[PDB]
Amino acid sequence: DIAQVQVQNKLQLAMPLLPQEVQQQGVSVEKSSSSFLMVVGVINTDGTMTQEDISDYVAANMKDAISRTSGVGDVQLFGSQYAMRIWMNPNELNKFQLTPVDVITAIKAQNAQVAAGQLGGTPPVKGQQLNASIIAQTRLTSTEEFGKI
Amino acid sequence: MPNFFIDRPIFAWVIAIIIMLAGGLAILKLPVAQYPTIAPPAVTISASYPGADAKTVQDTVTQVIEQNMNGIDNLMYMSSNSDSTGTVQITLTFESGTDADIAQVQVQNKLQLAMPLLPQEVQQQGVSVEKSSSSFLMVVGVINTDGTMTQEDISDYVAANMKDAISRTSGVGDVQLFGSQYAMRIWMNPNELNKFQLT
Amino acid sequence: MPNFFIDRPIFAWVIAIIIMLAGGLAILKLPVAQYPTIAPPAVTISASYP
Amino acid sequence: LDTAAAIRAELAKMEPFFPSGLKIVYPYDTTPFVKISIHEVVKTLVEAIILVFLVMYLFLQNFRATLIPTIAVPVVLLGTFAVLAAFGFSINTLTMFGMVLAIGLLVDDAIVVVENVERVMAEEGLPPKEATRKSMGQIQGALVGIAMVLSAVFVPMAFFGGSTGAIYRQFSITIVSAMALSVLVALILTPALCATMLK
Amino acid sequence: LDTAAAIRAELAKMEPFFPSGLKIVYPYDTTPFVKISIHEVVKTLVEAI
Amino acid sequence: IVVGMAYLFVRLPSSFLPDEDQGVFMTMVQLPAGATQERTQKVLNEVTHYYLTKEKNNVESVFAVNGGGQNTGIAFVSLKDWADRPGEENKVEAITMRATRAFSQIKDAMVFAFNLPAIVELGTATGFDFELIDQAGLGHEKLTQARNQLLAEAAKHPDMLTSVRPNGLEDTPQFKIDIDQEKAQALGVSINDINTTLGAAWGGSYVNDFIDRGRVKKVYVMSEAKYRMLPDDIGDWYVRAADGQMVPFSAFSSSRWEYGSPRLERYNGLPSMEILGQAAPGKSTGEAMELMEQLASKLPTGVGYDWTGMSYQERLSGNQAPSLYAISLIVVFLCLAALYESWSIPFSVMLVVPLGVIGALLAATFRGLTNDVYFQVGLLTTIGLSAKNAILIVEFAKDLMDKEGKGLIEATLDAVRMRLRPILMTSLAFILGVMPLVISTGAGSGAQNAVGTGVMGGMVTATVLAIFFVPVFFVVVRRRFS
Amino acid sequence: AAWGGSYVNDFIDRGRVKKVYVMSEAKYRMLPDDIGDWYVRAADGQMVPF
């Protein structure tokens, strides 16, 4: 335990020195054996779901819950959790005269979750009878939503 | 071994007196509680996204903490509350008799695996990892008899003279202030902002 | 201490039975591994620059 | 109580430098409760000692013969606290109640020790010093086996029940300690006192 | 074995809520080995008796 | 006596630790939605008015704390000294009851008054804590509906389940502001400007720190109260375009109402909803649990379930502790067989146990008390004491048999008179000794009673029964086995 | 971003937060000459090849 702790203490002595991309992708400190205990394979008999689908499911329903169990020091997933993939097209980007930077920024602008306070929160004027939170821009949820950005 | 002590009384007297002295000492140094520590360890992480709503809070702070929460020793269960007041409270419970210190440490280690994933507003407002009981020990009220200072003034004073010093004392896992420390408040006026054309 | 237990058999029986109960318990709670933790502790830090 | 006692320490360093009108109040204090709990247990302990002394003097009509079990009470009780410190137990409610219960299983051993010698003297007229040899040599194995079986009824309760069972352990150890101590005293102090004090 | 025994516990809470076609398999299990090891020792113990 | 003992044992209710008057108690105040701070304050003031006016003789100080959030409230009530509150009519058991009865009146305010569950967070009694899981991508609506289904079906079985309710909050109205991006770009305003203005005006913003009298504090920017209390006020705000023109919010933002939860709950990562509830006054927490697990199976696909807190207790008593009792009994029998050097003779000692349990049970039942920890340690204490009392008699008799050669029919009664006086001494002395415990009035009295009654009754009965039973217990065992 | 992909921000898929990666399609990052297929926007408004 301590032998992991001191390590992470000294790690976060240089976290702000790491690139922003690395910090976002996040580091990870573990204390595990180099040998696997057991491997739990998940297959599809109906042929309905491909390996990426299965990997997503076992990443979003199984891995996150199994790994929480004590004694389990490191679960290496044999796949990848789902992620919204934007496959750019340079020809059409140059056609409309756009850079990947414009796309990035457009995503960070139109796909965000903003804090927008409450209708008559604290403090209020005397005699207020209405107090409700306010919703503004929320995250996006589907392919189509990123489609019409 | 009777008839040996029966022949030598003062010996038995010495044993008994030594015993009474040992007990006499051990009744001074020994801590006086109501019951032993029976409740399971409960490490709690707390954050606050200022001016946010429940889903905004959960989807951008809570969920991004829960996923990075794994590979932690003797974890029983994790329950997280996401409030519309802009607040996350995740209470991890550990096995009975588990080393509390380590059980807090591993938690914070896994927390700072996703700190740069938190919003800038949250990081600035700062998260907080504690290891405390859900029941209050004692509550120290501070009042004003002269009528000179209002509750916000009193709260400021006890936040800037008392809370910060009391909480440093060992054994005290979490001091919940019943007020708010002073802060420079800028109360904007949209009419005059638009008048001079300012955002 | 032979001829004392030799004169009182049930006493020895009590000792032995207590022993067997202790072992009977300690075979339930005791963890069943292959070998003890022999490998040295290995803390690993991992990062990824995409 | 260490914490709530350190609170007043860290707080009395602020009281003088307080502004005009600040008064501290305590609207919630779950500390004097444990105080007037443990105190109210010590009270019943003392009262039990007194009443035991009264029954003793009611039967064995000697003012020095009734001192023997009386003396043998704090000896066994104090010594328990010592063992409770040597295992890591605290002077909580459960422990104290364990003592109050241990009273009877102390005074039983004591009374057997004294009264058997008394009887032997009233039926054989042997000089106390010899009568007590011939008596301890008659009740020794009885007392020891009694220790074994009583410890046998109390010990297994220390296991295990988790949260709820911790209390059962608090009682078990506190009681068995006082048992073995009561019997050790029953072979060391009580025979010696029943040899040098009895009329 | 506590870990690999807790795995099936945390896993049987997912089996019912699985989609149409998902089947779990165990292609690597260094757990029944220790089982039919210690068992095969107890066996020789009895036989020795 | 054995039969009646069993009957009194299964008829007697179960408990853990008694609620002790701690001189202080709490009062919870929950309001609807959204319920402004003013309403909560009014309710808290009604409460304080009650505790200060309708109960001056007992209540000393009410530290009421409005906060977190607007619709919640909590009062820490302190009482006067125990010696200044005589009788049951002044203890917390009556104060809290009377108070909550008086709080039944209050409209649109779930106000309750309750006493501290013994110690810290050891409130591992009083019902259960069922948790409902979103084991799939169902969302929040269908989870609310499923929880509604469970809470609806659970009110149709009031014969083994009660007080079925959620613990969190119900959906409240919310204000959605649709920022039309196209119009925002067309008018030439920056989206960052929009979101920043909105969040800073309506939600405040941590700018940077400042120094107040040597101590660093914060600087928050936030609209004044007047311009953030009503929906139309959204229009009062203007953001600066790229050119230099100020643009109203109504120009690009389309506002509307909606519905959202104010306390989202998650369990083990997955979305969840907490459901509280008690067991029926007659049934056990276990059967309530089983019923709940059968009702939650009738729920739509994807909604799982799990037990937490005082439901992850866990296991089992009384359903395992009798094994502790059993093995202890076995061990005792062993040591007894060791002392007596017989497999039969110790039975004469073993049969003395029910002679004391029958006293504890009678005492506990004829006082409204309950089988708790104190009662059980007092029980073990009782059986140990009685065991001692018997053991000394049988040992004396067997000494009279194996040293002199006296037959049982003489050696027994000869030894009993050699043992009668000390038995009576120890007995009477210990009975009077625990009298202060059973007599205890106020301040930790529930505990001293729970320890006192069972012990005294058990001791009396054991010492008035074994004194006639043990001499018979021996001769029956001795004859039958030789 | 084109050749190595980029972690932009997160999004919500069926209640669970996941990532959003931007990255060129496969066809335009397989060969060296494809470097030339990319254009960046200058300060004036003209697109410039790599």
Side-chain angles (χ1 to χ4, degrees):
Chain A
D1 311 316
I2 302 295
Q4 173 207 56
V5 184
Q6 300 175 345
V7 164
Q8 197 225 6
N9 159 274
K10 280 306 177 176
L11 209 209
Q12 313 206 239
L13 233 75
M15 277 288 293
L17 292 178
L18 294 179
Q20 180 64 24
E21 292 76 38
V22 166
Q23 296 190 39
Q24 283 205 314
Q25 283 299 140
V27 296
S28 61
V29 179
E30 306 159 334
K31 45 158 191 176
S32 64
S33 58
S34 57
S35 85
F36 291 93
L37 198 160
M38 62 135 51
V39 171
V40 179
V42 179
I43 73 179
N44 175 231
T45 69
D46 287 21
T48 58
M49 47 193 59
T50 76
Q51 83 97 25
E52 305 176 10
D53 308 320
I54 303 175
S55 297
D56 166 51
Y57 184 78
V58 309
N61 297 263
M62 309 179 65
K63 157 182 164 57
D64 202 42
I66 290 302
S67 185
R68 221 173 309 279
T69 303
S70 182
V72 188
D74 175 37
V75 178
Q76 185 57 40
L77 174 66
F78 296 112
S80 167
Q81 189 186 73
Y82 262 176
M84 185 56 76
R85 280 317 196 109
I86 301 295
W87 304 115
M88 333 196 62
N89 198 325
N91 294 334
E92 296 174 348
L93 279 180
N94 160 262
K95 181 179 182 178
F96 293 101
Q97 309 159 21
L98 291 170
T99 60
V101 187
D102 300 315
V103 166
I104 290 267
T105 309
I107 295 180
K108 291 181 183 178
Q110 306 191 35
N111 177 51
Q113 185 91 249
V114 284
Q118 324 169 16
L119 264 172
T122 55
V125 287
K126 294 191 173 186
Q128 174 68 353
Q129 298 291 119
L130 172 65
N131 169 255
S133 194
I134 304 182
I135 322 295
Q137 291 185 7
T138 177
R139 300 283 191 189
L140 275 60
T141 52
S142 66
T143 85
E144 181 182 18
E145 285 188 324
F146 277 100
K148 50 185 181 180
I149 288 187
Chain B
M1 46 182 64
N3 43 278
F4 185 86
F5 283 96
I6 297 175
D7 238 12
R8 306 181 71 163
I10 301 185
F11 211 77
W13 270 105
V14 167
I15 293 188
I17 290 176
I18 285 180
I19 292 170
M20 283 183 288
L21 280 183
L25 257 63
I27 205 178
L28 313 176
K29 275 289 303 176
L30 220 54
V32 185
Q34 185 185 349
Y35 298 110
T37 64
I38 292 155
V43 182
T44 312
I45 322 169
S46 307
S48 64
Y49 196 1
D53 63 87
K55 170 176 281 295
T56 282
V57 173
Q58 179 198 245
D59 294 16
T60 216
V61 186
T62 312
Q63 291 198 22
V64 80
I65 285 184
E66 296 186 344
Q67 295 187 354
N68 285 259
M69 281 299 160
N70 50 14
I72 315 174
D73 298 327
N74 286 24
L75 182 147
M76 278 173 54
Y77 43 73
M78 162 188 58
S79 63
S80 67
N81 307 126
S82 303
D83 323 25
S84 276
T85 185
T87 302
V88 192
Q89 190 162 109
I90 311 125
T91 314
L92 301 90
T93 310
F94 296 88
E95 307 281 14
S96 307
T98 297
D99 193 357
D101 311 316
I102 302 295
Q104 173 207 56
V105 184
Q106 300 175 345
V107 164
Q108 197 225 6
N109 159 274
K110 280 306 177 176
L111 209 209
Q112 313 206 239
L113 233 75
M115 277 288 293
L117 292 178
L118 294 179
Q120 180 64 24
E121 292 76 38
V122 166
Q123 296 190 39
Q124 283 205 314
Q125 283 299 140
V127 296
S128 61
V129 179
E130 306 159 334
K131 45 158 191 176
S132 64
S133 58
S134 57
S135 85
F136 291 93
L137 198 160
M138 62 135 51
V139 171
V140 179
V142 179
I143 73 179
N144 175 231
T145 69
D146 287 21
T148 58
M149 47 193 59
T150 76
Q151 83 97 25
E152 305 176 10
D153 308 320
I154 303 175
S155 297
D156 166 51
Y157 184 78
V158 309
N161 297 263
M162 309 179 65
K163 157 182 164 57
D164 202 42
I166 290 302
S167 185
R168 221 173 309 279
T169 303
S170 182
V172 188
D174 175 37
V175 178
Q176 185 57 40
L177 174 66
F178 296 112
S180 167
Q181 189 186 73
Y182 262 176
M184 185 56 76
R185 280 317 196 109
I186 301 295
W187 304 115
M188 333 196 62
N189 198 325
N191 294 334
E192 296 174 348
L193 279 180
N194 160 262
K195 181 179 182 178
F196 293 101
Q197 309 159 21
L198 291 170
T199 60
Chain C
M1 46 182 64
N3 43 278
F4 185 86
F5 283 96
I6 297 175
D7 238 12
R8 306 181 71 163
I10 301 185
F11 211 77
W13 270 105
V14 167
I15 293 188
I17 290 176
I18 285 180
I19 292 170
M20 283 183 288
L21 280 183
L25 257 63
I27 205 178
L28 313 176
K29 275 289 303 176
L30 220 54
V32 185
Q34 185 185 349
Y35 298 110
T37 64
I38 292 155
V43 182
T44 312
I45 322 169
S46 307
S48 64
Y49 196 1
Chain D
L1 186 140
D2 329 30
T3 298
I7 292 301
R8 184 50 184 269
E10 282 242 8
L11 205 68
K13 299 167 76 281
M14 307 175 182
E15 305 185 19
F17 314 105
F18 276 171
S20 59
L22 267 216
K23 173 180 295 183
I24 300 183
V25 296
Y26 316 89
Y28 195 91
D29 203 354
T30 73
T31 295
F33 164 72
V34 187
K35 202 166 187 176
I36 326 181
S37 171
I38 261 59
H39 193 89
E40 269 294 333
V41 178
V42 168
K43 193 172 187 177
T44 66
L45 242 186
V46 165
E47 297 174 7
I49 278 190
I50 289 186
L51 269 61
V52 158
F53 182 88
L54 291 185
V55 175
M56 282 300 307
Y57 192 83
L58 190 58
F59 276 73
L60 305 186
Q61 303 114 13
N62 180 263
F63 225 134
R64 199 161 75 172
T66 176
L67 201 67
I68 299 181
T70 295
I71 291 179
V73 171
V75 172
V76 179
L77 249 52
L78 287 169
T80 313
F81 291 105
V83 189
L84 292 179
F87 273 168
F89 287 73
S90 50
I91 320 181
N92 46 29
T93 317
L94 311 173
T95 284
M96 296 307 297
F97 283 161
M99 309 291 97
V100 184
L101 286 182
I103 301 177
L105 295 142
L106 195 176
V107 303
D108 199 329
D109 283 318
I111 287 177
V112 168
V113 169
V114 185
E115 117 85 48
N116 198 235
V117 180
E118 274 281 354
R119 166 188 308 277
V120 166
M121 289 195 300
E123 298 175 353
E124 276 227 48
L126 263 53
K129 189 176 184 178
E130 202 67 26
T132 194
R133 288 192 199 254
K134 295 294 187 174
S135 182
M136 278 296 304
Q138 185 212 312
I139 58 183
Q140 170 190 330
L143 290 185
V144 172
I146 278 173
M148 276 296 105
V149 295
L150 271 44
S151 61
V153 322
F154 283 110
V155 165
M157 207 52 54
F159 319 136
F160 32 91
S163 70
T164 306
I167 298 94
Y168 289 144
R169 187 175 187 176
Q170 301 286 329
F171 275 94
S172 284
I173 301 302
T174 42
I175 294 175
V176 184
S177 311
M179 281 284 185
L181 287 173
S182 171
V183 183
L184 285 173
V185 167
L187 276 91
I188 295 178
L189 189 67
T190 75
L193 261 52
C194 292
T196 29
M197 295 180 175
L198 293 184
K199 183 190 296 295
Chain E
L1 186 140
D2 329 30
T3 298
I7 292 301
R8 184 50 184 269
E10 282 242 8
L11 205 68
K13 299 167 76 281
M14 307 175 182
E15 305 185 19
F17 314 105
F18 276 171
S20 59
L22 267 216
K23 173 180 295 183
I24 300 183
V25 296
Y26 316 89
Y28 195 90
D29 203 354
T30 73
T31 295
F33 164 72
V34 187
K35 202 166 187 176
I36 326 181
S37 171
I38 261 59
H39 193 89
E40 269 294 333
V41 178
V42 168
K43 193 172 187 177
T44 66
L45 242 186
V46 165
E47 297 174 7
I49 278 190
Chain F
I1 297 172
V2 177
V3 175
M5 182 196 70
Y7 184 61
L8 282 176
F9 191 79
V10 294
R11 190 103 179 189
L12 192 71
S14 296
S15 178
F16 175 53
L17 285 190
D19 295 29
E20 295 282 11
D21 184 22
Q22 296 204 16
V24 291
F25 68 94
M26 293 186 290
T27 294
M28 297 296 298
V29 173
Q30 288 278 42
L31 257 61
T36 50
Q37 199 177 41
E38 190 159 326
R39 306 224 297 264
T40 301
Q41 194 59 37
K42 182 173 180 294
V43 178
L44 287 176
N45 284 14
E46 281 200 20
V47 177
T48 303
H49 171 267
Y50 169 82
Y51 282 139
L52 292 187
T53 58
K54 285 183 181 296
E55 204 109 30
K56 328 175 188 62
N57 299 20
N58 302 325
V59 180
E60 169 80 354
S61 59
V62 182
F63 190 78
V65 269
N66 196 331
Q70 293 194 27
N71 52 5
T72 207
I74 164 181
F76 297 115
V77 179
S78 177
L79 305 161
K80 293 192 175 185
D81 191 25
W82 325 83
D84 307 336
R85 290 158 42 244
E88 278 200 58
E89 299 175 331
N90 297 331
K91 262 55 179 182
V92 278
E93 189 168 359
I95 292 188
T96 60
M97 204 279 180
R98 225 181 311 115
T100 189
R101 170 180 289 183
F103 288 156
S104 65
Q105 171 199 3
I106 314 183
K107 187 177 182 301
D108 260 324
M110 195 202 74
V111 175
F112 284 110
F114 78 106
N115 180 27
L116 325 174
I119 172 242
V120 199
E121 25 169 313
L122 194 50
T124 64
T126 70
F128 52 86
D129 188 14
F130 187 83
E131 194 99 36
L132 203 66
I133 310 289
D134 178 36
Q135 211 90 21
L138 312 177
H140 178 86
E141 307 89 4
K142 310 167 191 173
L143 221 186
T144 308
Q145 296 179 357
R147 186 220 57 177
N148 274 256
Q149 175 175 352
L150 191 57
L151 290 173
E153 282 292 327
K156 294 166 55 182
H157 286 51
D159 42 38
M160 44 199 57
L161 205 74
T162 186
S163 184
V164 282
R165 58 189 170 94
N167 185 31
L169 306 182
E170 346 290 341
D171 295 10
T172 80
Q174 290 178 336
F175 205 79
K176 174 72 174 185
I177 306 174
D178 223 25
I179 303 299
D180 182 22
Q181 289 291 323
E182 183 184 8
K183 202 61 180 179
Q185 287 187 346
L187 288 173
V189 299
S190 184
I191 303 92
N192 285 335
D193 284 345
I194 304 183
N195 285 334
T196 307
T197 50
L198 186 51
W202 293 78
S205 190
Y206 188 18
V207 194
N208 61 333
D209 294 327
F210 87 105
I211 303 304
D212 181 41
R213 290 125 55 185
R215 170 172 279 259
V216 51
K217 299 175 182 179
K218 302 171 180 51
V219 179
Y220 285 88
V221 86
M222 191 178 188
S223 177
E224 201 228 300
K226 290 199 303 178
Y227 308 97
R228 56 175 185 86
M229 208 62 56
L230 290 184
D232 285 328
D233 308 331
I234 288 285
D236 294 343
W237 293 93
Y238 295 81
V239 300
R240 177 164 42 85
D243 47 39
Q245 301 179 4
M246 307 304 294
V247 181
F249 248 106
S250 61
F252 45 79
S253 124
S254 69
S255 67
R256 74 178 186 277
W257 287 96
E258 218 187 14
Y259 266 140
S261 169
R263 186 199 171 102
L264 273 60
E265 313 185 33
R266 307 182 64 92
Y267 196 90
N268 289 342
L270 307 155
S272 70
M273 288 179 171
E274 183 175 60
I275 293 181
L276 261 56
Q278 298 272 15
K283 292 304 183 179
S284 58
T285 300
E287 297 190 3
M289 283 171 46
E290 301 176 61
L291 172 60
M292 292 286 278
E293 298 190 28
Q294 291 188 24
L295 298 179
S297 58
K298 278 295 201 305
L299 293 181
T301 313
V303 181
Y305 80 99
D306 201 283
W307 297 100
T308 188
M310 62 189 63
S311 299
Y312 204 102
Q313 193 66 81
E314 179 210 84
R315 81 95 71 91
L316 338 75
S317 287
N319 203 121
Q320 190 70 18
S323 177
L324 313 175
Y325 275 10
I327 66 172
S328 188
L329 186 75
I330 297 303
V331 168
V332 170
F333 168 80
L334 294 185
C335 304
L336 285 171
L339 178 62
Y340 294 146
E341 259 295 331
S342 175
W343 300 113
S344 71
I345 301 181
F347 271 91
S348 58
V349 174
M350 303 258 72
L351 293 179
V352 88
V353 179
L355 305 175
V357 184
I358 190 56
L361 290 168
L362 278 168
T365 312
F366 277 111
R367 253 272 279 182
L369 228 50
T370 162
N371 169 33
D372 54 338
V373 172
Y374 297 139
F375 178 79
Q376 296 180 230
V377 300
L379 205 163
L380 270 59
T381 300
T382 320
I383 78 170
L385 239 172
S386 58
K388 207 184 207 308
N389 293 11
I391 282 168
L392 284 167
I393 304 176
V394 27
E395 159 67 13
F396 271 8
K398 191 181 178 304
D399 255 337
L400 289 185
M401 295 193 309
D402 300 22
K403 190 176 184 180
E404 276 58 56
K406 300 178 179 180
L408 38 90
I409 205 176
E410 185 237 317
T412 50
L413 58 86
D414 202 332
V416 187
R417 93 171 196 269
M418 190 156 63
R419 191 99 283 273
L420 193 273
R421 185 178 70 166
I423 288 174
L424 289 193
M425 292 174 65
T426 291
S427 178
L428 190 73
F430 186 58
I431 294 169
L432 296 176
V434 303
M435 183 99 76
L437 299 188
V438 67
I439 224 60
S440 183
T441 60
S445 280
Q448 291 193 16
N449 290 330
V451 177
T453 79
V455 159
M456 183 174 63
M459 190 57 180
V460 171
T461 61
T463 56
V464 302
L465 260 55
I467 213 58
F468 295 118
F469 275 97
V470 182
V472 185
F473 286 165
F474 185 81
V475 295
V476 165
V477 165
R478 198 65 244 267
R479 285 179 184 264
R480 183 72 159 87
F481 299 90
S482 63
Chain G
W3 293 78
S6 190
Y7 188 18
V8 194
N9 61 333
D10 294 327
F11 87 105
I12 303 304
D13 181 41
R14 290 125 55 185
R16 170 172 279 259
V17 51
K18 299 175 182 179
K19 302 171 180 51
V20 179
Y21 285 88
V22 86
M23 191 178 188
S24 177
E25 201 228 300
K27 290 199 303 178
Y28 308 97
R29 56 175 185 86
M30 208 62 56
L31 290 184
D33 285 328
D34 308 331
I35 288 285
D37 294 343
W38 293 93
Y39 295 81
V40 300
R41 177 164 42 85
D44 47 39
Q46 301 179 4
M47 307 304 294
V48 181
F50 248 106

